[PDB]
Design a protein around this ligand. Structure first.
Ligand SMILES: Nc1cncc(-c2cn3ccnc3c(Nc3ccc(N4CCN(C5COC5)CC4)cc3)n2)n1
Length: 258
């Protein structure tokens, strides 16, 4: 899974950044054709964290998950992935307010299929948000940013940590337990973000203020122009009790029929 640095050419402009360091556009010389790529370039536990991210991506093979090309150890550690040219979903929608709601449903349904696969694979994403959905085209979305993801043990359906608070279900905040159902709650917030054309959720509120609101049974309101069925699904994703909240099979199934 180890790439040749001479076969990788990086562009100076940067696509994004994270605690890991920077993301740059590049080109990798494949078997004959050259492939456009996005490269995460490492800036102390980050190397192990980047390698863990690569380990998850190596195991995943689904049309709605960003594909990794490989890793390269050169001037810095690099995670080379196929390029999703149109970038993060939230920024795209902030700049393209005329996408049809039908178009949004198609994109959020694609996200549920990638997440259904991840759930079937017993991986939890733990960072599912509109900023981590990338557009290949306006009609093809892929899930990215597996830096926090975990492979669940064969005998448990959750990972217990020893944070993007606004995307986390109550059981994550209160008990530190992350499951596919926790990702479902995030998917509900992601849906809200998508239908709000990339506005931030719980605008102007502290994480502790968000937690108090949810405990009161309050939820974000319906974004302007959002179809009732999609708001209803969001509310179902925001079911307080992990046991009664739907899984991705149920979410994906509802989205497919709609
Ligand atoms: N963890 C992070 C943090 N940041 C980025 C990424 C990231 C990861 N990936 C994996 C595959 N593909 C991508 C990708 N792709 C991308 C494509 C286009 C843009 N945009 C840059 C700004 N641009 C304006 C400046 O000129 C117009 C709009 C398009 C950004 C990212 N990004 N991962």
């Amino acid at each position: 899974v180890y790439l040749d640095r001479k076969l990788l050419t990086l562009e100076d402009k940067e696509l994004g950044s994270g605690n890991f360091g920077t993301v740059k556009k590049g080109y990798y010389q494949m078997k004959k054709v050259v492939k456009t790529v996005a490269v995460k370039i490492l800036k102390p536990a980050l190397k192990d964290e980047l390698l863990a991210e690569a380990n998850v991506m190596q195991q995943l093979d689904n049309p709605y998950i960003v594909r990794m090309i490989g890793i390269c150890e050169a001037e810095s550690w690099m995670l080379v992935m196929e390029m999703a040219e149109l970038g993060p979903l939230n920024k795209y929608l902030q700049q393209n307010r005329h996408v049809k709601d039908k178009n949004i449903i198609e994109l959020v349904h694609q996200v549920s299929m990638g997440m259904k696969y991840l759930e079937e694979s017993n991986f939890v994403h733990r960072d599912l948000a509109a900023r981590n959905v990338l557009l290949v085209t306006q009609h093809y979305a892929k899930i990215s940013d597996f830096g926090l993801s975990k492979a669940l043990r064969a005998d448990e359906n959750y990972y217990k940590a020893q944070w993007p608070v606004k995307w986390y279900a109550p059981e994550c905040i209160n008990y530190y337990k992350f499951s596919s159902k926790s990702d479902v709650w995030s998917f509900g917030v992601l849906m809200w973000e998508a239908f709000s054309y990339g506005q931030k959720p719980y605008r102007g509120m502290k994480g502790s203020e968000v937690t108090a609101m949810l405990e009161k049974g309050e939820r974000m309101g319906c974004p302007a122009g959002c179809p009732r069925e999609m708001y209803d699904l969001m509310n179902l994703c925001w079911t307080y009790d992990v046991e009664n909240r739907p899984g991705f099979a149920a979410v994906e199934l509802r989205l497919r029929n709609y």
